[PDB]
């Protein structure tokens, strides 16, 4: 059954320079009953947002300024509707918890029109009205005993984390687990308390974060480059069997696509290759 519920923004915080954590209250105390990886659908009515109304804080407000970005406004005629994936597992109930990316006008091309639903959930605040309806899902984890791998990317936290958090303490599972993050610097890293609890809750789960450009401010003693090669280089290239994991991606189209040829050069088959793909 596909329902719609009428739900009030409990927060719409930056978990980074560009991702917002739409918290939503399921009304009556009900519970979306979906699956981990799994996603719903936002519609929105005929609005016009300006982004100089969104509240960014000045952690991450940096980029914003030196881009522009507060410059940007977005009408729209008739009502929209798009996907987002659940970053909350099935047994966090009450609470639909999404990381949505705003999708500002590509750098390569900056003067078109800005993401239409993404810029308005960036303008939707604490007891807003959103209206979402659901659940749908496509992308489950395979119920096997392999070795699974997690990467991710950008908004793609979101189902990486209601995958890890469903097989853990939903499943109880014991199969070897990992996670790898990658991100820009140290302040677009978030959920870094909720996986260090789970992988110290959990012997067979650990989990990496690699930065693709640190930044002087954060320290980082950590991995650096791009998640695919970091992954390869340091666990994948001297694993005995490559194969024989299961990989659950999901992230930006070239991290996808890196990932992707990374694998198969591995001699991975695509039956093991199990792709979250945000269409961007
Ligand atoms: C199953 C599924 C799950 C998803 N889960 C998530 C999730 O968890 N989090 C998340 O953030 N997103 C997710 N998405 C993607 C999401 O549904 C939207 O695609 C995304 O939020 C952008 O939608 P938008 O309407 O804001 O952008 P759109 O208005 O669709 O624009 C898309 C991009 O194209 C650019 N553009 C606009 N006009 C032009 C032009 N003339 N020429 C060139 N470029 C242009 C815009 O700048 C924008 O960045 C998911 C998608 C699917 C299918």
């Known amino acids: 059954g596909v329902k719609k519920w009428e739900c009030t ?14 918290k939503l209250a399921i009304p009556d105390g009900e519970s979306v ?4 990886g799994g996603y719903i659908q936002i519609e929105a009515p005929a609005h016009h947002v300006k982004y100089a109304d969104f509240d960014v804080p000045e952690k991450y407000r940096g980029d914003w300024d030196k881009f522009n970005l507060f410059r940007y406004e977005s009408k729209v005629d008739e009502p929209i509707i798009r996907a987002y994936s659940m970053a909350n ?22 003067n078109v029109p800005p993401g239409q639903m993404s810029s308005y959930i960036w303008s939707l605040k604490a007891g807003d009205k959103c209206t979402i309806s659901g659940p749908f899902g496509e992308f489950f984890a395979k119920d ?11 908004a793609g936290m979101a189902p990486m984390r209601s995958h890890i958090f469903d097989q853990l303490k939903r499943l109880k599972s014991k199969r070897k687990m990992s996670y790898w993050y990658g991100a820009r610097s140290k302040r677009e890293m978030f959920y870094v308390e909720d996986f260090d609890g789970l992988a110290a809750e959990n012997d067979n789960f650990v989990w990496h ?7 002087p401010e954060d320290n980082w003693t950590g991995y650096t480059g791009f998640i695919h090669n ?31 040829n990374m694998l198969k050069n591995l001699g991975v088959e695509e039956e093991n290759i199990l792709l979250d793909d945000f269409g961007g």
Do not use: W
């Open 33 to 36: 009953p979906f699956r981990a």
């Open 230 to 260: 970091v992954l390869y280089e340091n666990y994948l290239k001297d694993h005995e069997a490559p194969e024989d994991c299961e990989y659950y991606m999901c992230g930006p189209p070239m991290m996808n696509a890196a990932v992707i």
């Open 9 to 22: 923004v409990i927060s719409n915080d930056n978990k980074a320079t560009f991702i917002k954590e739409l």
């Open 144 to 154: 096997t005993d392999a070795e699974m791998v997690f990467i991710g990317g950008g």
């Open 209 to 215: 974060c690699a930065l693709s450009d640190p930044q």
């Open 89 to 110: 597992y099935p047994e966090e109930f009450g609470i639909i918890m999404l990381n949505v990316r705003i999708a500002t006008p590509p750098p390569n091309n900056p």
